[PDB]
Amino acid sequence: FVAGVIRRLDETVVNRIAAGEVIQRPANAIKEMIENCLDAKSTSIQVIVKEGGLKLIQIQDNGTGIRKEDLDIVCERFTTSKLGFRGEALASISHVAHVTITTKTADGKCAYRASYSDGKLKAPPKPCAGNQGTQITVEDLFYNIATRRKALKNPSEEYGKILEVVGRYSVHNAGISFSVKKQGETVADVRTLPNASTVDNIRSIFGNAVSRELIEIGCEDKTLAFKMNGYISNANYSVKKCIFLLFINHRLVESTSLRKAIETVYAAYLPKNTHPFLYLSLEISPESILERVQQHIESKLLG
Amino acid sequence: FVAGVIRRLDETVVNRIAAGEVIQRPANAIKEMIENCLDAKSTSIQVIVKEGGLKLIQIQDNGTGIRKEDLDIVCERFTTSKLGFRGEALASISHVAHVTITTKTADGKCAYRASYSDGKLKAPPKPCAGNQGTQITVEDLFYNIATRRKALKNPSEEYGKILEVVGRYSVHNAGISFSVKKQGETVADVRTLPNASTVDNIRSIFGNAVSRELIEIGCEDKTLAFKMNGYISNANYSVKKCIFLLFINHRLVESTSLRKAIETVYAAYLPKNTHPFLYLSLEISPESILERVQQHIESKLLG
Ligand SMILES: Nc1ncnc2c1ncn2[C@@H]1O[C@H](COP(=O)(O)OP(=O)(O)O)[C@@H](O)[C@H]1O
Ligand SMILES: Nc1ncnc2c1ncn2[C@@H]1O[C@H](COP(=O)(O)OP(=O)(O)O)[C@@H](O)[C@H]1O
Ligand SMILES: [Mg+2]
Ligand SMILES: [Mg+2]
């Protein structure tokens, strides 16, 4: 038994593998990029996809853009214009894809384009055509981690997941226009419009049969420091699988705990196989609160 | 609406906060350090604690030690002598505590002592007294993150958690001697001995009433690529709360899924309130396997 010798991991490998762990699949890259479009005050967001996002993801917005002088560092880890940690999403994407950014600010004379590998600027940004806002292009996702590339689903399931994410951000963000299409196709698979209510976007993404059966919900509680709004299906609507959109502080989230609560409430009113449609937006800042929601929904179902 | 300006996070803050997130509490620092003692082929491990591990944790082993020339980088991130990622545990601890290491290799002429802040060597290592192996001393845990220091439990609950961890590693590692005491006390609260069987260490840590009621278990399956051994309580033993030790590849782990399976099996044999004692060691390399364990245990309870 002798002592080992300590070496350093190659963190070009470490950083690639961790970035794979964060991103996971094209829908998730797209989720991060959309959130950036919304943070940059965009009112029009367009998504274009080739091969389920494995070949190309392109997202164009009309938001505030990235200043020319900041393109040097925008994809580095822990660089952010905002107050896990801020500044990891584009850095991560850039470690497992070829990223190009085309962007213009109101105060810039023209748009600039820059390309990145592993978080680093490849060359000085170059002026190009383009209007107010930002187009990010993400190519060959996981070209450098074979195991995750093969561990992804077929192109049409991955496209399916992108639709789910974008359609879901579009219900939460009524008034902002969203679209998703496959590259080289002219007709969008999802398209919402700048003057749409929350209910119109539910009708558009989820169909007239759900939109006709919605109950509006809201409750605030200053003592429990939370607010909630959204829409739920009344006791007359039933499908084979529960469609549950959940947003907590404007991020889309999954929650086995709360979907359980609400299912128990609905179990008493809906048929044996069948399930509800749920859209809830919770505003919280940093337990018994999940009683008030179960209570509030049951109250609304009884009414 | 104008464009932001991108700045860099201070990663002295980032690194401190993430390290808090990993470590969480003294029992967990101790878990990481013990595992290092075992990796370094230690047969005698001594733990000493002041104030539940908030003031001092000291762990002495007789393992292979750290070479003098490697003390410079041992607490840096991603430095390891081994093949999330390797090399994060001591780096993390050193970002939220004052770490001192005293260590000797068989080939070194004497032990060397070094002190670290934020992963960096404070001064050149200095020769000192000490035998084969390594003593790590971890002081003032979370002195630099007030919110986690107050979010820790009272000193005696945290000490309680250290006992749990060490007692549990000691059942898995029969033949290796472990002890834990409070600083300045002469009698250990936990002590296992170099010639002890697994059953002796269960008797010692968990008492004669459990050790008298154990069924040995083992199953291998080449097709499902797993092995399992351990000990369980037979249908005659019952306590108010389920004591379940689980090791997968020699790390202690919690598992709501498998503890559920086994509880369902035991529910049929044990009284209404009461629960079993379980020690299982699973060897796996990188679903239907949880059926074989539920099956194998029921089989052993029926027999
Ligand atoms: N669509 C966009 N429009 C304007 N700025 C963007 C856009 N996407 C990214 N950015 C800029 O790049 C930075 C890094 O983004 P990201 O890596 O997601 O970290 P974060 O959003 O936490 O700051 C943002 O703070 C922002 O300044
Ligand atoms: N008790 C110990 N005895 C010998 N070497 C140790 C001990 N603790 C830590 N080390 C050394 O420091 C390195 C860093 O430990 P750690 O930060 O836990 O990362 P890892 O265990 O993944 O290598 C180990 O690879 C090992 O060489
Ligand atoms: Mg972002
Ligand atoms: Mg370790």
mmCIF file of C-alpha atoms in Angstrom, chain A:
data_model
loop_
_atom_site.group_PDB
_atom_site.id
_atom_site.type_symbol
_atom_site.label_atom_id
_atom_site.label_comp_id
_atom_site.label_asym_id
_atom_site.label_seq_id
_atom_site.Cartn_x
_atom_site.Cartn_y
_atom_site.Cartn_z
ATOM 1 C CA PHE A 1 0.000 0.000 0.000
ATOM 2 C CA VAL A 2 1.655 3.236 -1.221
ATOM 3 C CA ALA A 3 0.371 6.808 -1.379
ATOM 4 C CA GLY A 4 -1.191 8.069 -4.590
ATOM 5 C CA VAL A 5 -0.022 11.032 -6.590
ATOM 6 C CA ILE A 6 -2.490 13.848 -6.998
ATOM 7 C CA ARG A 7 -3.195 15.102 -10.529
ATOM 8 C CA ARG A 8 -5.676 17.722 -11.969
ATOM 9 C CA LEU A 9 -8.744 16.654 -13.935
ATOM 10 C CA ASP A 10 -8.797 18.099 -17.485
ATOM 11 C CA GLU A 11 -11.556 20.515 -17.002
ATOM 12 C CA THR A 12 -12.214 20.776 -20.774
ATOM 13 C CA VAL A 13 -13.709 17.306 -20.196
ATOM 14 C CA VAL A 14 -15.266 18.241 -16.805
ATOM 15 C CA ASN A 15 -16.940 21.291 -18.213
ATOM 16 C CA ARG A 16 -18.360 19.470 -21.214
ATOM 17 C CA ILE A 17 -19.792 16.666 -19.085
ATOM 18 C CA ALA A 18 -21.391 19.042 -16.521
ATOM 19 C CA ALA A 19 -22.890 21.177 -19.307
ATOM 20 C CA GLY A 20 -24.526 18.004 -20.748
ATOM 21 C CA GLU A 21 -25.979 17.366 -17.299
ATOM 22 C CA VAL A 22 -27.586 20.812 -17.150
ATOM 23 C CA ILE A 23 -28.931 21.019 -20.710
ATOM 24 C CA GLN A 24 -29.944 17.376 -21.268
ATOM 25 C CA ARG A 25 -32.001 17.887 -24.420
ATOM 26 C CA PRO A 26 -33.028 20.494 -26.960
ATOM 27 C CA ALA A 27 -36.312 21.456 -25.174
ATOM 28 C CA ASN A 28 -34.291 22.481 -22.188
ATOM 29 C CA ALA A 29 -31.842 24.654 -24.147
ATOM 30 C CA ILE A 30 -34.902 26.271 -25.672
ATOM 31 C CA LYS A 31 -36.513 26.806 -22.257
ATOM 32 C CA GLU A 32 -33.363 28.720 -21.089
ATOM 33 C CA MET A 33 -33.216 30.790 -24.278
ATOM 34 C CA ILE A 34 -36.885 31.775 -24.127
ATOM 35 C CA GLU A 35 -36.487 32.895 -20.577
ATOM 36 C CA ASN A 36 -33.639 35.094 -21.742
ATOM 37 C CA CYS A 37 -35.911 36.535 -24.487
ATOM 38 C CA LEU A 38 -38.480 37.366 -21.773
ATOM 39 C CA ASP A 39 -35.880 38.895 -19.471
ATOM 40 C CA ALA A 40 -34.744 41.105 -22.388
ATOM 41 C CA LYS A 41 -38.347 42.455 -22.727
ATOM 42 C CA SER A 42 -39.162 40.720 -26.049
ATOM 43 C CA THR A 43 -42.765 40.869 -27.353
ATOM 44 C CA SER A 44 -42.247 38.651 -30.387
ATOM 45 C CA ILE A 45 -40.360 35.336 -30.163
ATOM 46 C CA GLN A 46 -39.792 32.962 -33.136
ATOM 47 C CA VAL A 47 -38.374 29.402 -32.809
ATOM 48 C CA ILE A 48 -37.083 27.362 -35.745
ATOM 49 C CA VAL A 49 -35.882 23.806 -35.465
ATOM 50 C CA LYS A 50 -34.174 21.205 -37.563
ATOM 51 C CA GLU A 51 -34.366 17.469 -36.605
ATOM 52 C CA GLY A 52 -35.952 17.946 -33.166
ATOM 53 C CA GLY A 53 -33.292 20.457 -32.175
ATOM 54 C CA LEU A 54 -30.381 18.011 -32.658
ATOM 55 C CA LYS A 55 -29.251 19.699 -35.846
ATOM 56 C CA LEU A 56 -30.414 23.349 -35.328
ATOM 57 C CA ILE A 57 -32.300 25.539 -32.925
ATOM 58 C CA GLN A 58 -32.779 29.148 -33.835
ATOM 59 C CA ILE A 59 -34.583 31.654 -31.696
ATOM 60 C CA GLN A 60 -35.211 35.236 -32.895
ATOM 61 C CA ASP A 61 -36.531 37.937 -30.523
ATOM 62 C CA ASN A 62 -37.190 41.726 -30.681
ATOM 63 C CA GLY A 63 -35.884 42.409 -27.186
ATOM 64 C CA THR A 64 -33.203 44.782 -25.946
ATOM 65 C CA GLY A 65 -30.255 42.877 -27.408
ATOM 66 C CA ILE A 66 -26.646 42.380 -26.277
ATOM 67 C CA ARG A 67 -24.244 45.335 -26.484
ATOM 68 C CA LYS A 68 -21.437 44.857 -28.978
ATOM 69 C CA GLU A 69 -18.710 45.237 -26.396
ATOM 70 C CA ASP A 70 -20.326 42.441 -24.232
ATOM 71 C CA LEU A 71 -20.260 39.801 -27.018
ATOM 72 C CA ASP A 72 -16.672 38.982 -25.994
ATOM 73 C CA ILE A 73 -17.802 37.462 -22.659
ATOM 74 C CA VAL A 74 -21.505 36.699 -22.963
ATOM 75 C CA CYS A 75 -21.019 32.862 -23.139
ATOM 76 C CA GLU A 76 -18.503 32.666 -20.275
ATOM 77 C CA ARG A 77 -19.526 31.099 -17.029
ATOM 78 C CA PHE A 78 -20.815 33.564 -14.421
ATOM 79 C CA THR A 79 -21.242 36.490 -16.768
ATOM 80 C CA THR A 80 -24.636 38.092 -16.541
ATOM 81 C CA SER A 81 -26.345 41.494 -16.806
ATOM 82 C CA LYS A 82 -28.787 40.489 -13.987
ATOM 83 C CA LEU A 83 -28.589 41.207 -10.207
ATOM 84 C CA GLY A 84 -28.352 27.769 -9.529
ATOM 85 C CA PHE A 85 -26.306 30.905 -10.220
ATOM 86 C CA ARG A 86 -26.861 33.610 -12.806
ATOM 87 C CA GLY A 87 -24.840 33.293 -15.903
ATOM 88 C CA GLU A 88 -24.588 29.543 -16.553
ATOM 89 C CA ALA A 89 -27.102 28.841 -19.293
ATOM 90 C CA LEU A 90 -25.349 30.151 -22.443
ATOM 91 C CA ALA A 91 -21.945 29.048 -21.080
ATOM 92 C CA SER A 92 -23.314 25.512 -20.711
ATOM 93 C CA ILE A 93 -24.980 25.437 -24.144
ATOM 94 C CA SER A 94 -21.744 26.655 -25.726
ATOM 95 C CA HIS A 95 -19.766 23.728 -24.240
ATOM 96 C CA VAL A 96 -22.041 21.184 -26.025
ATOM 97 C CA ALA A 97 -22.999 23.009 -29.277
ATOM 98 C CA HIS A 98 -21.913 25.502 -31.906
ATOM 99 C CA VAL A 99 -23.414 28.779 -30.848
ATOM 100 C CA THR A 100 -23.829 31.857 -32.993
ATOM 101 C CA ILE A 101 -25.377 35.075 -31.855
ATOM 102 C CA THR A 102 -26.700 37.842 -33.965
ATOM 103 C CA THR A 103 -27.789 40.911 -32.051
ATOM 104 C CA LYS A 104 -28.613 44.628 -32.121
ATOM 105 C CA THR A 105 -29.255 47.198 -29.371
ATOM 106 C CA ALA A 106 -31.305 50.403 -29.892
ATOM 107 C CA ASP A 107 -28.094 52.450 -29.346
ATOM 108 C CA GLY A 108 -25.914 50.319 -31.678
ATOM 109 C CA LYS A 109 -25.486 51.450 -35.323
ATOM 110 C CA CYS A 110 -25.961 47.862 -36.609
ATOM 111 C CA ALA A 111 -26.243 44.272 -35.513
ATOM 112 C CA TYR A 112 -23.168 42.183 -34.791
ATOM 113 C CA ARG A 113 -22.674 38.428 -35.208
ATOM 114 C CA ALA A 114 -20.381 36.269 -33.086
ATOM 115 C CA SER A 115 -19.610 32.569 -32.882
ATOM 116 C CA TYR A 116 -18.487 30.612 -29.826
ATOM 117 C CA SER A 117 -16.759 27.326 -28.925
ATOM 118 C CA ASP A 118 -16.583 26.218 -25.301
ATOM 119 C CA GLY A 119 -17.708 29.631 -24.030
ATOM 120 C CA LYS A 120 -15.041 31.548 -25.932
ATOM 121 C CA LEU A 121 -15.431 34.013 -28.730
ATOM 122 C CA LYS A 122 -13.943 32.461 -31.929
ATOM 123 C CA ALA A 123 -13.271 35.804 -33.651
ATOM 124 C CA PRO A 124 -14.056 39.468 -33.220
ATOM 125 C CA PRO A 125 -17.768 40.155 -33.699
ATOM 126 C CA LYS A 126 -18.584 41.234 -37.277
ATOM 127 C CA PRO A 127 -21.307 43.687 -38.377
ATOM 128 C CA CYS A 128 -24.277 42.092 -40.160
ATOM 129 C CA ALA A 129 -27.861 42.612 -41.190
ATOM 130 C CA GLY A 130 -30.518 42.444 -38.463
ATOM 131 C CA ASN A 131 -33.013 44.505 -36.498
ATOM 132 C CA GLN A 132 -33.556 45.307 -32.839
ATOM 133 C CA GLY A 133 -33.105 42.128 -30.754
ATOM 134 C CA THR A 134 -31.291 38.846 -30.760
ATOM 135 C CA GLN A 135 -31.104 35.646 -32.765
ATOM 136 C CA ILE A 136 -29.303 32.759 -31.137
ATOM 137 C CA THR A 137 -28.486 29.760 -33.251
ATOM 138 C CA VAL A 138 -27.546 26.463 -31.562
ATOM 139 C CA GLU A 139 -26.152 23.730 -33.811
ATOM 140 C CA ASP A 140 -25.222 20.069 -33.454
ATOM 141 C CA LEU A 141 -26.290 19.702 -29.859
ATOM 142 C CA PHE A 142 -24.044 17.140 -28.083
ATOM 143 C CA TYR A 143 -21.770 16.715 -31.113
ATOM 144 C CA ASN A 144 -19.032 16.282 -28.433
ATOM 145 C CA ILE A 145 -20.721 13.847 -26.042
ATOM 146 C CA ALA A 146 -21.711 10.776 -28.041
ATOM 147 C CA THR A 147 -23.424 9.070 -25.129
ATOM 148 C CA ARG A 148 -26.042 11.815 -24.608
ATOM 149 C CA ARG A 149 -26.560 12.292 -28.353
ATOM 150 C CA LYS A 150 -27.614 8.613 -28.628
ATOM 151 C CA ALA A 151 -29.476 8.789 -25.256
ATOM 152 C CA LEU A 152 -31.756 11.464 -26.777
ATOM 153 C CA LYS A 153 -35.107 10.433 -28.146
ATOM 154 C CA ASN A 154 -36.087 10.284 -31.809
ATOM 155 C CA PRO A 155 -36.282 13.640 -33.634
ATOM 156 C CA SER A 156 -40.078 13.781 -33.461
ATOM 157 C CA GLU A 157 -40.321 13.145 -29.676
ATOM 158 C CA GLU A 158 -37.718 15.818 -29.077
ATOM 159 C CA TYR A 159 -39.655 18.229 -31.381
ATOM 160 C CA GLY A 160 -42.740 17.187 -29.436
ATOM 161 C CA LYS A 161 -41.002 18.277 -26.223
ATOM 162 C CA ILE A 162 -40.019 21.648 -27.689
ATOM 163 C CA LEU A 163 -43.691 22.245 -28.627
ATOM 164 C CA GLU A 164 -44.721 21.417 -25.107
ATOM 165 C CA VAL A 165 -42.259 23.926 -23.599
ATOM 166 C CA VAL A 166 -42.965 26.741 -26.031
ATOM 167 C CA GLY A 167 -46.744 26.244 -25.952
ATOM 168 C CA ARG A 168 -46.536 26.360 -22.205
ATOM 169 C CA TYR A 169 -44.472 29.555 -21.968
ATOM 170 C CA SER A 170 -47.038 31.021 -24.445
ATOM 171 C CA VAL A 171 -50.028 30.393 -22.132
ATOM 172 C CA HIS A 172 -48.199 32.069 -19.216
ATOM 173 C CA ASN A 173 -47.127 35.008 -21.412
ATOM 174 C CA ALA A 174 -50.299 36.013 -23.209
ATOM 175 C CA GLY A 175 -49.761 39.241 -25.197
ATOM 176 C CA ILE A 176 -46.287 38.143 -26.240
ATOM 177 C CA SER A 177 -46.281 36.329 -29.584
ATOM 178 C CA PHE A 178 -44.605 32.931 -29.875
ATOM 179 C CA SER A 179 -44.172 30.599 -32.798
ATOM 180 C CA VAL A 180 -42.416 27.314 -33.504
ATOM 181 C CA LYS A 181 -41.786 25.788 -36.920
ATOM 182 C CA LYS A 182 -39.582 23.218 -38.564
ATOM 183 C CA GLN A 183 -36.916 24.708 -40.753
ATOM 184 C CA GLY A 184 -37.925 25.162 -44.411
ATOM 185 C CA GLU A 185 -41.642 24.883 -43.563
ATOM 186 C CA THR A 186 -43.740 27.968 -43.999
ATOM 187 C CA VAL A 187 -46.682 27.169 -41.589
ATOM 188 C CA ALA A 188 -45.956 27.321 -37.854
ATOM 189 C CA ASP A 189 -47.017 24.381 -35.620
ATOM 190 C CA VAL A 190 -47.605 26.781 -32.745
ATOM 191 C CA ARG A 191 -48.387 30.474 -33.159
ATOM 192 C CA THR A 192 -49.853 32.918 -30.640
ATOM 193 C CA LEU A 193 -50.647 36.497 -31.345
ATOM 194 C CA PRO A 194 -49.776 39.842 -29.711
ATOM 195 C CA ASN A 195 -53.352 40.629 -28.635
ATOM 196 C CA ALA A 196 -54.286 37.304 -27.055
ATOM 197 C CA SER A 197 -55.753 36.651 -23.636
ATOM 198 C CA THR A 198 -54.626 33.703 -21.497
ATOM 199 C CA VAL A 199 -57.793 31.883 -22.482
ATOM 200 C CA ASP A 200 -57.186 32.401 -26.201
ATOM 201 C CA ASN A 201 -53.777 30.823 -25.895
ATOM 202 C CA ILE A 202 -55.206 27.898 -23.981
ATOM 203 C CA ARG A 203 -57.859 27.507 -26.785
ATOM 204 C CA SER A 204 -55.101 27.758 -29.400
ATOM 205 C CA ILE A 205 -52.592 25.338 -27.865
ATOM 206 C CA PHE A 206 -55.020 22.968 -26.098
ATOM 207 C CA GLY A 207 -58.229 23.219 -28.218
ATOM 208 C CA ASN A 208 -61.803 24.497 -27.864
ATOM 209 C CA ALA A 209 -62.957 21.527 -25.720
ATOM 210 C CA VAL A 210 -60.718 22.569 -22.817
ATOM 211 C CA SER A 211 -61.099 26.327 -23.258
ATOM 212 C CA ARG A 212 -64.924 26.000 -23.054
ATOM 213 C CA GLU A 213 -64.623 24.350 -19.572
ATOM 214 C CA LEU A 214 -62.286 26.687 -17.625
ATOM 215 C CA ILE A 215 -62.660 28.153 -14.203
ATOM 216 C CA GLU A 216 -60.571 31.165 -13.339
ATOM 217 C CA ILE A 217 -58.772 30.956 -10.076
ATOM 218 C CA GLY A 218 -56.960 33.387 -7.873
ATOM 219 C CA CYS A 219 -56.057 33.780 -4.247
ATOM 220 C CA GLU A 220 -53.655 35.984 -2.335
ATOM 221 C CA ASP A 221 -52.545 35.548 1.282
ATOM 222 C CA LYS A 222 -50.309 38.195 2.900
ATOM 223 C CA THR A 223 -49.770 36.053 6.041
ATOM 224 C CA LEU A 224 -48.553 33.048 3.955
ATOM 225 C CA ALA A 225 -46.655 35.425 1.597
ATOM 226 C CA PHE A 226 -47.958 33.988 -1.684
ATOM 227 C CA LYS A 227 -50.300 34.719 -4.642
ATOM 228 C CA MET A 228 -51.788 32.449 -7.247
ATOM 229 C CA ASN A 229 -53.759 32.686 -10.463
ATOM 230 C CA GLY A 230 -54.565 30.605 -13.476
ATOM 231 C CA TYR A 231 -57.264 28.457 -14.953
ATOM 232 C CA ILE A 232 -58.542 24.958 -14.274
ATOM 233 C CA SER A 233 -61.013 22.597 -15.957
ATOM 234 C CA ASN A 234 -64.405 22.277 -14.181
ATOM 235 C CA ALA A 235 -65.909 18.907 -13.243
ATOM 236 C CA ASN A 236 -67.361 18.342 -16.775
ATOM 237 C CA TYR A 237 -63.946 18.034 -18.584
ATOM 238 C CA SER A 238 -62.054 14.733 -18.571
ATOM 239 C CA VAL A 239 -59.101 13.281 -20.618
ATOM 240 C CA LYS A 240 -56.980 10.084 -20.369
ATOM 241 C CA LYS A 241 -53.918 11.988 -18.991
ATOM 242 C CA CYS A 242 -53.555 15.043 -16.667
ATOM 243 C CA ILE A 243 -52.281 18.152 -18.448
ATOM 244 C CA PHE A 244 -50.724 20.332 -15.725
ATOM 245 C CA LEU A 245 -48.874 23.594 -16.501
ATOM 246 C CA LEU A 246 -47.055 24.987 -13.428
ATOM 247 C CA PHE A 247 -45.172 28.306 -13.204
ATOM 248 C CA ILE A 248 -43.489 29.480 -9.984
ATOM 249 C CA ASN A 249 -41.920 32.886 -10.443
ATOM 250 C CA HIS A 250 -42.392 32.664 -14.197
ATOM 251 C CA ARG A 251 -40.314 29.457 -14.667
ATOM 252 C CA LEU A 252 -42.066 26.290 -15.833
ATOM 253 C CA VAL A 253 -41.698 23.525 -13.203
ATOM 254 C CA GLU A 254 -42.730 19.893 -12.456
ATOM 255 C CA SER A 255 -44.116 19.039 -8.990
ATOM 256 C CA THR A 256 -45.207 15.535 -7.912
ATOM 257 C CA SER A 257 -46.345 16.933 -4.534
ATOM 258 C CA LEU A 258 -48.835 19.582 -5.759
ATOM 259 C CA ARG A 259 -50.114 17.538 -8.757
ATOM 260 C CA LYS A 260 -50.899 14.845 -6.122
ATOM 261 C CA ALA A 261 -52.868 17.285 -3.944
ATOM 262 C CA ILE A 262 -54.930 18.568 -6.883
ATOM 263 C CA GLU A 263 -55.536 15.056 -8.276
ATOM 264 C CA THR A 264 -56.949 14.007 -4.872
ATOM 265 C CA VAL A 265 -59.327 16.955 -5.005
ATOM 266 C CA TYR A 266 -60.369 16.107 -8.605
ATOM 267 C CA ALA A 267 -60.619 12.345 -7.897
ATOM 268 C CA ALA A 268 -63.836 13.094 -5.996
ATOM 269 C CA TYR A 269 -65.470 14.892 -9.003
ATOM 270 C CA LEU A 270 -63.976 13.466 -12.248
ATOM 271 C CA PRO A 271 -64.562 9.900 -13.688
ATOM 272 C CA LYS A 272 -62.313 6.858 -12.858
ATOM 273 C CA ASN A 273 -59.684 6.964 -15.657
ATOM 274 C CA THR A 274 -60.025 10.689 -16.409
ATOM 275 C CA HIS A 275 -58.038 13.774 -15.364
ATOM 276 C CA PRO A 276 -58.134 17.606 -15.436
ATOM 277 C CA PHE A 277 -56.462 20.438 -17.257
ATOM 278 C CA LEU A 278 -54.529 22.823 -14.907
ATOM 279 C CA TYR A 279 -52.691 26.151 -15.469
ATOM 280 C CA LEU A 280 -51.406 27.773 -12.245
ATOM 281 C CA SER A 281 -49.043 30.722 -11.715
ATOM 282 C CA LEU A 282 -47.606 31.017 -8.205
ATOM 283 C CA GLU A 283 -45.754 34.122 -6.971
ATOM 284 C CA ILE A 284 -43.578 33.256 -3.962
ATOM 285 C CA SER A 285 -40.543 34.870 -2.311
ATOM 286 C CA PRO A 286 -37.713 32.749 -0.731
ATOM 287 C CA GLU A 287 -46.096 23.741 3.481
ATOM 288 C CA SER A 288 -49.449 24.933 4.899
ATOM 289 C CA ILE A 289 -49.600 27.024 1.672
ATOM 290 C CA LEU A 290 -50.367 23.816 -0.335
ATOM 291 C CA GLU A 291 -53.524 23.437 1.838
ATOM 292 C CA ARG A 292 -54.827 26.845 0.685
ATOM 293 C CA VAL A 293 -54.455 25.804 -3.010
ATOM 294 C CA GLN A 294 -56.112 22.400 -2.443
ATOM 295 C CA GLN A 295 -58.793 24.274 -0.481
ATOM 296 C CA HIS A 296 -59.161 27.060 -3.062
ATOM 297 C CA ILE A 297 -59.543 24.650 -6.002
ATOM 298 C CA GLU A 298 -62.066 22.409 -4.237
ATOM 299 C CA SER A 299 -63.989 25.578 -3.376
ATOM 300 C CA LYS A 300 -63.932 26.537 -7.110
ATOM 301 C CA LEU A 301 -64.991 23.012 -8.214
ATOM 302 C CA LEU A 302 -67.940 23.025 -5.755
ATOM 303 C CA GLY A 303 -68.893 26.452 -7.139
#
